[PDB]
Structure 1
Amino acid sequence: AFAVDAAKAYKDYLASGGQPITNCVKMLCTHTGTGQAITVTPEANMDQESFGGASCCLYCRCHIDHPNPKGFCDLKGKYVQIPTTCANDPVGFTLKNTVCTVCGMWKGYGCSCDQ
């Protein structure tokens, strides 16, 4: 029943006061984009940075298996938008947050489906 839990290990290293994963690939873009979370091209709005997806995926970056049956990555080959105030830790952000399945924004960071 043993499985490595890297998500939990990273969250705990962050809480311990560890330096977040660096060298996430930040893109140049207009910053007039839709602001959605994970897109086929950079979509950062005025409050977001856009990064190359693979460089922000914990499983990609650590060379470990993706936690799902067929091991698919939903960041690789896409761009992930990160609020500018959290862009110092894109990996942590994507791991600790969730995408609204209806509007495509980050829940709590642009998703307005609950007001």
Structure 2
Amino acid sequence: AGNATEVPANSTVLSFCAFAVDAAKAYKDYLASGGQPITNCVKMLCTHTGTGQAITVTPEANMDQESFGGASCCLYCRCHIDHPNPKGFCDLKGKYVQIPTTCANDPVGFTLKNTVCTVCGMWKGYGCSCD
């Protein structure tokens, strides 16, 4: 009974971060000792004629990005643990996340490390042009 959600390749990293006192640090440390990034994400087939923006309600990748379902990007969502917010809610679940194609091999690690410009909606360092 029930419907499987995960694949054997993610068991190690999902189990490690599911027990960690500090999941974000655990995943970065896990990546730093050569673990492979979390796979089985929700990759979108889209036109790549979108605004290029970071977090959106419909897929918005341009020609240098991939679009992903946002929850599949949320570490907290992938491990089913508490979210670091005071109110405990996720900013990515229910949205689409645009990831640079060069970083598309690790969507979960990208969003852990990066931040979105609240003025232009672009990733800082990967699209934000703000002075």
TM-score, reference length from structure 2: 0.84
In the alignment of these two chains, the number of paired residues is 114
Are 1:23 and 2:49 an aligned pair?
Answer: no
Distance verdict in 2 for CA 1:87–1:37, change over 3 Å: same
Q: Say what the alpha-carbon RMSD is for the aligned residues.
A: 2.2
Q: Which residue of 2 aligns with 1:38?
A: 55
Deviations 1:56-112 (A, max 9, x none): 100000110001111110000100000001100000001100000100000000000
SS at 1:11's partner residue?
A: helix
SS at 2:19's partner residue?
A: coil
Q: Is the 8 A contact 2:20 2:26 kept in 1?
A: no
- Give the Cα–Cα distance (whole angstroms) in 1 for the partners of residues 42 and 92 of structure 2: 12
**Aligned structure 1 segments of 4 or more residues deviating by more than 3 angstroms:** none
Are 1:67 and 2:84 an aligned pair?
Answer: yes
- Give the Cα–Cα distance (whole angstroms) in 2 for the partners of residues 91 and 15 of structure 1: 14
Q: Which residue of 2 aligns with 1:99?
A: 116
Q: Which blocks of at least 5 consecutive residues in structure 1 are unaligned?
A: none
Q: Which has the higher contact order (CA 8 A, sep 6+)?
A: 1
Are 1:81 and 2:107 an aligned pair?
Answer: no
C-alpha deviation, 1:28, in angstroms: 0.9
Q: Which blocks of at least 5 consecutive residues in structure 2 are unaligned?
A: 1-17
- Give the Cα–Cα distance (whole angstroms) in 1 for the partners of residues 59 and 122 of structure 2: 14
